[PDB]
């Protein structure tokens, strides 16, 4: 019935966005499911998955068809957090071009710069800083991105950017 049809379609769109299969994304996307959610996992949208799994053209396709650049998963992450976590520079630059909030905060008040700093993503850190990421922001535990950084190159980068 229409209900199970919608369920099958949502799941197939999320899978296609994770795998980067643009032909399936084009076929299955609708204005009603563009921001559908992986309810069995992190409640990610197709754009979260395209960002996290480094599928740039699927990501821009989703953005060009109304994907919410500031949609939050169950932890408060927006897709820029996923790109920051895994170091996907071109994805992050695209999300910034589509007016994402560079200093967005998740449920623990981590910003994308906290995420890139903790995960060792040096060029992503530099990109975020060049677009106004604030290295003085503390998460809920009181930690700046520098406090989370363990790599020499990222620590040097953040120390330079901080007052």
């Amino acid at each position: 019935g229409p209900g199970s049809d919608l369920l099958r379609g949502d799941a197939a769109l999320l899978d296609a966005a994770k795998k980067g299969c643009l032909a399936r994304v084009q076929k299955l996307c609708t204005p009603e499911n563009i921001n559908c959610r992986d309810t069995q996992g992190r409640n990610s949208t197709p754009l979260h998955l395209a960002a996290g799994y480094n599928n740039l053209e699927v990501a821009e396709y989703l953005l060009e068809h109304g994907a919410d650049v500031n949609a939050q998963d169950k932890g408060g992450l927006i897709p820029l957090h996923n790109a920051a976590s895994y170091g996907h520079v071109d994805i992050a630059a695209l999300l910034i071009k589509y007016n994402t909030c560079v200093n967005a905060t998740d449920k623990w008040a981590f910003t994308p710069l906290h995420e890139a700093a903790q995960k060792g993503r040096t060029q992503l850190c530099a990109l975020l800083l060049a677009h106004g990421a604030d290295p003085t922001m503390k998460n809920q535990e009181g930690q700046t991105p520098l406090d989370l950084a363990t790599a020499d190159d990222i620590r040097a980068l953040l120390i330079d950017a901080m007052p």
Partner: peptide, 10 residues
């Protein structure tokens, strides 16, 4: 914090 789990991606 401790409950924080990884973002979707690779």
């Amino acid at each position: 914090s401790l409950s924080r789990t990884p973002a979707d991606g690779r």
